[PDB]
Amino acid sequence: MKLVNFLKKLRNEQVTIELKNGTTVWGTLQSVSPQMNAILTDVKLTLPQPRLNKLNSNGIAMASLYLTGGQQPTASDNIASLQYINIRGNTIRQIILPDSLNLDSLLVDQKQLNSLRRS
Amino acid sequence: MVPPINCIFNFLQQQTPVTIWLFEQIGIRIKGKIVGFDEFMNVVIDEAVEIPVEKGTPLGKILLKGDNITLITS
Amino acid sequence: PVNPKPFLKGLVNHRVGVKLKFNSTEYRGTLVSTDNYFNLQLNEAEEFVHGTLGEIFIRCNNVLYIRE
Amino acid sequence: LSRAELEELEEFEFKHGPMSLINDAMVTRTPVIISLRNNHKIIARVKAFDRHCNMVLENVKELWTEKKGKNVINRERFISKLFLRGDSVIVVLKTP
Amino acid sequence: GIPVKLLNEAQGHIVSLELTTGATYRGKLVESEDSMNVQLRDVIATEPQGAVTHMDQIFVRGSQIKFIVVPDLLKNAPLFKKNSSRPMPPIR
Amino acid sequence: VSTPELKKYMDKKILLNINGSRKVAGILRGYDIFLNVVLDDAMEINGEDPANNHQLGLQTVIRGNSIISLEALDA
Amino acid sequence: KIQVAHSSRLANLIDYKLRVLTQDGRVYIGQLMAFDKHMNLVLNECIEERVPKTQLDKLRPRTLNIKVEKRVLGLTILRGEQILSTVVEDKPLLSKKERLVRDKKEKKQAQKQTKLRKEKEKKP
Amino acid sequence: RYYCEYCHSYLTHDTLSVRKSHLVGKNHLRITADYYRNKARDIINKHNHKRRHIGKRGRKERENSSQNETLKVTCLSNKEKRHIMHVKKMNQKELAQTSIDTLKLLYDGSPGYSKVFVDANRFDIGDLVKASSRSRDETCESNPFPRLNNPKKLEPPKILSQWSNTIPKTSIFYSV
Amino acid sequence: MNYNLSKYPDDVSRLFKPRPPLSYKRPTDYPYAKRQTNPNITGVANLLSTSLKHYMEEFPEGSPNNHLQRYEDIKLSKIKNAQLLDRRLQNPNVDPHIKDTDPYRTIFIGRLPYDLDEIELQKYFVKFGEIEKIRIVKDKITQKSKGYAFIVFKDPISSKMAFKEIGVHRGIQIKDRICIVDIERG
RNA sequence: UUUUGGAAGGUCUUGGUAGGAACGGGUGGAUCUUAUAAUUUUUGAUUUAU
RNA sequence: UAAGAUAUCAGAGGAAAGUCCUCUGAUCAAACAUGCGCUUCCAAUAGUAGAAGGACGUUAAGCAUUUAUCAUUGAACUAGUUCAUUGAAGUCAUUGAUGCAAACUCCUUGGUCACACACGGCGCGGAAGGCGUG
């Protein structure tokens, strides 16, 4: 079994990939690779504010957010919108998938059934 | 030539006490006799002691994982 | 003359401590079984970094050493 | 080995091995606690798992605490359905 | 894979490196293997806090390379031809 | 897959950097496909040349997941 | 700015001036030319762009101007381990129609070489 | 299988060493030497044929340029331009291979000339050139007085052919 | 360049001119020694297991794993497959249709054309000794010829010589199909 | 009388205009699955944290 | 490095279980065509312009800041400071580096198209997508 073969069927869905850095990426998903290289479209990648009376946020990710060339100058809070972001798999920590879709239709892997039906 | 897996084996049979420097993050050096090893350079240490970097407690018989092995030294 | 893979087989259902690399945290309980990759499973464990825990699974990467 | 031989091996290690804790937690509808290497813990129910220890979860409640000069706060974030990458986890306990 | 096959195309020309520790080596590249590890000859080595020295011979684990800068005339070597017509192979 | 070709290096004195800061100089005996390396008469170099420098052991073997560079300070 | 094809993978967008991010927060912006199984890539005329430590207080949440210190390095071969994501910047110098034209003339010219080589190898 | 796409040929017996015998083979070296010599000139010889954008000229500038007289242009013949491009291409080859090394010629009998200009035996480069006579042992005991019918006069300064008739015709003093 | 330790001659080696040395830029990420993932991972506490009850009362009944019932549908269907096979194995000394003379005299013939007859079967098999009986077997549920028959010879040596000849000979062609022969098996 | 489909003629518009089909190979390259979660890329030592 | 494979699903058929193979549906993909009052963009000459991107260009030693080794021994000294000697390492820079801002110059790009100087479309293209049929 590969549970990455579950993600491949989750195509054209709204999703939030949430990265190792702490950068969340709200967008429309396209073809996920076998190594989990998720590739999105109409995206909005942001950093949350850890409040706690001005605790300094992720110093590396703020640089990488501005560098994408998506951060608009009058973005007061720390966000950056753009089209098309290709994301290397290993960086994914979580993927917050939406409420509407039913798991029971999608978690039935075809190669799982095709091993038992063949025997 | 003297391959390393060959030369790890010449601490097993010779019964020499070794010191093993770990990954710099953790902050301890382990020492004691290397009994036996696997293909993945993870070893069992007999009569082991945990020195922070000479007041550290004795461990006993410890299987050490091969991600954290930096040096193995006599 | 004991190798590592047979060493885990000897330590089946005995009281072991397993040290994660992070905050000098040993998990103190009775081992259940082992994997090919030294994934672990515990019963009646105790977390020493104080608490008494139920039934634990530990992933392989995170472990430093295994003691009896 | 053959392709059919590994299918037997995978069914064993999920059923009679360390990952049997997760597999017996999926079937019996028992909630788990997971600790990621993020240093924040999620209290959830498993719906699938896999070789790499990644897993699809349901009714996730994350619990993340942060500190800055000995000033603590305990934040709680609720999620309906989540897909967790498997390298992040270090310890999975199964609740009584 | 072309990224690696290019590095063999650059033997005996001056290249740069940038190890993930943040150093910068730049000398003539003598050897390379399929895991992107290299032996440089007659190099100039720039430590991450700017300190520069010269060393005759150096080996680097390929795993620690962040990028390699190659001479610019290989941009049109024939790895990058899309439509290529190989002849029919000789029979073994 | 392939063995790293340090065939020309062996039996010469060799400085190499372990992880970040530690530098270890010795005489290179043997190597393997992972670049775990073993060397005789090791000595851990530091800022003060005779003072903080101390010898390690008669034979020491280094894991290849902590080699960064490996310069050959001889011919 | 530029609208990329809604289902276009990394194989499609050759010659597109990309904007690749590494783990350290440094960005290499150049024309892509190859890629690989584990996603290491060859840019053609790339420029590394870094936000210096002094400027970084300015990006903390309150028109902002950031002094981005950049250095040219033509024709790199990056490594996969380091890449964090990619984003598209410009589109290639040649058209979509013109990239088909240059293919068919090169596909024709490549075939002519083999037949002129095979008959020069056959008789002599 | 494996093949070398500079030569366009497949290897007959695939091993690692047969590759290395082809990779440093005399035939293959002459190809890859010649392949990059062609790509070198082709970026220069195929000069950027720029695309023009013609603006509709003004009423004002069309009257100010009409009163200004039309200048004569000069077009050479086809036979003429085939020769003048043969010359100008051969001239730029010369400016590649000038390498003005008068300064090496000046310090010939000096006391460290063996150690700095011979360049088989420097320190920086010296170890690298021995792999791929006038030795370093030379001191200032041999040839004590340079001028003992040994030295050659300094070769005079070069001059442009095109403008070879701008030179003053007579010297100021009578040379031998 | 001066030396050029390369395969190429001096002109071609000077042709690959490298861009000048990289400008130095003071680094912004963390130094390689200091690099580490988050340490001080506070374990699954007793206080955490005390705050489980706020989660447990909220979601006391877990959602039903209906994707598992697709697997419990198939695996239980395979066990029911064995029970229908178990209904058949209890039912050959009974069948009446296989209960004439000695089973050492009986040839099995199989793969016979659906559209054979017992007279063409008799012709071919009478090639290897006098016949005591035939029967083609037909589906008792509706009389499709099953493609097998049982043929009792007056001697078991003629039954084993018929076996020899007309099965290991690729399968005896009768009408247009390649007919295995065996001994009775059953 | 209308809708749906098929055949022909007329008119507008747009593309192509020298290669195409079958068949054959101990043929090339792409992708996919598994060996492969065990130091050299993708199953975590870069949110600087006690 | 090797082995295997070349869309998935469902139904009918040929050699109780499964495999192999064939035509019929659904879904998926690619290429090619071809449409949408589909979306966005395509620069003065009735003028000496201007838009996007640069400059690893100048003004400019701008202006405003902060930086230039450690150990050992003696003298004086307040109750730290200077001078001289001995050892250790030592990117270059202080016209620097770091922060702030402007002006000027120069480089690459394009339909610099056709019709009109006329009180919230339905000119002929090209470029970039989205969407739909075949």
Curated annotation (Swiss-Prot), chain A:
Assigned keywords, A-Z: Cytoplasm, mRNA processing, mRNA splicing, Nucleus, Ribonucleoprotein, RNA-binding
One GO process term, biological-process aspect: 7-methylguanosine cap hypermethylation
Part of the whole protein covered: 1 to 119 of 146
Domain remarks: C-terminal extension may function as a nuclear localization signal (NLS).
Domain of life assignment: Eukaryota
Species, as recorded: Saccharomyces cerevisiae (strain ATCC 204508 / S288c)
Domain Sm: 2-101
Lineage of origin: Eukaryota, Fungi, Dikarya, Ascomycota, Saccharomycotina
Function: lays a role in pre-mRNA splicing as a core component of the spliceosomal U1, U2, U4 and U5 small nuclear ribonucleoproteins (snRNPs), the building blocks of the spliceosome. Also binds telomerase RNA and is required for its accumulation.
Keyword RNA-binding appears in the UniProt entry: yes
Designated name of the protein: Small nuclear ribonucleoprotein Sm D1
Entry GO CC: catalytic step 2 spliceosome; commitment complex; cytoplasm; cytosol; nucleus; pICln-Sm protein complex; precatalytic spliceosome; Prp19 complex
UniProt keyword Transmembrane helix present: no
Additional information: Present with 2400 molecules/cell in log phase SD medium.
Location in the cell: Nucleus; Cytoplasm
Family: Belongs to the snRNP core protein family.
Known partners and oligomeric status: Component of the Sm core complex, present in spliceosomal snRNP U1, U2, U4/U6 and U5. The core complex contains SMB1, SMD1, SMD2, SMD3, SME1, SMX3 and SMX2 (Sm proteins B, D1, D2, D3, E, F and G, respectively), and is probably a heptameric ring structure.
GO molecular function: mRNA binding; RNA binding
Curated annotation (Swiss-Prot), chain B:
GO BP, one annotated term: 7-methylguanosine cap hypermethylation
Pfam families xref list: LSM
GO molecular function, one term: splicing factor binding
Localization (cell): Cytoplasm; Nucleus
UniProt xrefs under PANTHER family: SMALL NUCLEAR RIBONUCLEOPROTEIN E
Miscellaneous: Present with 556 molecules/cell in log phase SD medium.
Name of the protein in its database record: Small nuclear ribonucleoprotein E
UniProt source species: Saccharomyces cerevisiae (strain ATCC 204508 / S288c) (Baker's yeast)
Top-level taxonomy: Eukaryota, Fungi, Dikarya, Ascomycota, Saccharomycotina
From Swiss-Prot, chain F:
Gene Ontology cellular component list: catalytic step 2 spliceosome; commitment complex; cytoplasm; nucleus; precatalytic spliceosome; SMN-Sm protein complex; spliceosomal complex; spliceosomal tri-snRNP complex
GO molecular function: RNA binding
SMART domains the record matches: Sm (SM00651)
Cellular compartment(s): Nucleus; Cytoplasm
GO biological process, alphabetically ordered: 7-methylguanosine cap hypermethylation; mRNA 5'-splice site recognition; mRNA splicing, via spliceosome; spliceosomal complex assembly; spliceosomal snRNP assembly; U2-type prespliceosome assembly
Top-level lineage group: Eukaryota
Primary localisation category: nucleus
Short name of any one Pfam family annotated for the protein: LSM
InterPro entries tied to this protein: Lsm7/SmG-like, LSM_dom_sf, Sm, Sm_dom_euk/arc, Sm_G
PROSITE patterns the record matches: SM (PS52002)
Domain (Sm): residue spans on this chain: 1-75
UniProt KW keywords: Cytoplasm, mRNA processing, mRNA splicing, Nucleus, Ribonucleoprotein, RNA-binding, Spliceosome
Miscellaneous comment in the UniProt entry for this protein: Present with 1400 molecules/cell in log phase SD medium.
Family: Belongs to the snRNP Sm proteins family.
Function: Plays a role in pre-mRNA splicing as a core component of the spliceosomal U1, U2, U4 and U5 small nuclear ribonucleoproteins (snRNPs), the building blocks of the spliceosome.
Summary of subunit composition and partner proteins: Component of the Sm core complex, present in spliceosomal snRNP U1, U2, U4/U6 and U5. The core complex contains SMB1, SMD1, SMD2, SMD3, SME1, SMX3 and SMX2 (Sm proteins B, D1, D2, D3, E, F and G, respectively), and is probably a heptameric ring structure. SMX2 specifically interacts with SME1.
Name used for this protein in its record: Small nuclear ribonucleoprotein G
Name of the gene encoding the protein in the UniProt record: SMX2
From Swiss-Prot, chain G:
UniProt biased composition (Basic and acidic residues): 99-109
Sm domain: residues covered: 5-92
Family per similarity comment: Belongs to the snRNP SmB/SmN family.
BP GO terms, sorted: 7-methylguanosine cap hypermethylation; mRNA 5'-splice site recognition; mRNA splicing, via spliceosome; spliceosomal complex assembly; spliceosomal snRNP assembly; U2-type prespliceosome assembly
Note: Present with 861 molecules/cell in log phase SD medium.
Subcellular location as annotated: Nucleus; Cytoplasm
Subunit structure: Component of the Sm core complex, present in spliceosomal snRNP U1, U2, U4/U6 and U5. The core complex contains SMB1, SMD1, SMD2, SMD3, SME1, SMX3 and SMX2 (Sm proteins B, D1, D2, D3, E, F and G, respectively), and is probably a heptameric ring structure. SMB1 specifically interacts with SMD3.
Nuclear localization signal, short sequence motif: residues: 96-123
Alphabetic keyword roster: Cytoplasm, mRNA processing, mRNA splicing, Nucleus, Ribonucleoprotein, RNA-binding
Gene Ontology CC terms, in alphabetical order: catalytic step 2 spliceosome; commitment complex; cytoplasm; nucleus; Prp19 complex; spliceosomal complex; U1 snRNP; U2 snRNP
MF GO annotations: RNA binding; snRNP binding
Protein name stated in the entry: Small nuclear ribonucleoprotein-associated protein B
Function recorded in the entry: Plays a role in pre-mRNA splicing as a core component of the spliceosomal U1, U2, U4 and U5 small nuclear ribonucleoproteins (snRNPs), the building blocks of the spliceosome.
Residue runs in coiled coils: none
Top-level taxon: Eukaryota
Main location: nucleus
Record remark: domains: C-terminal extension may function as a nuclear localization signal (NLS).
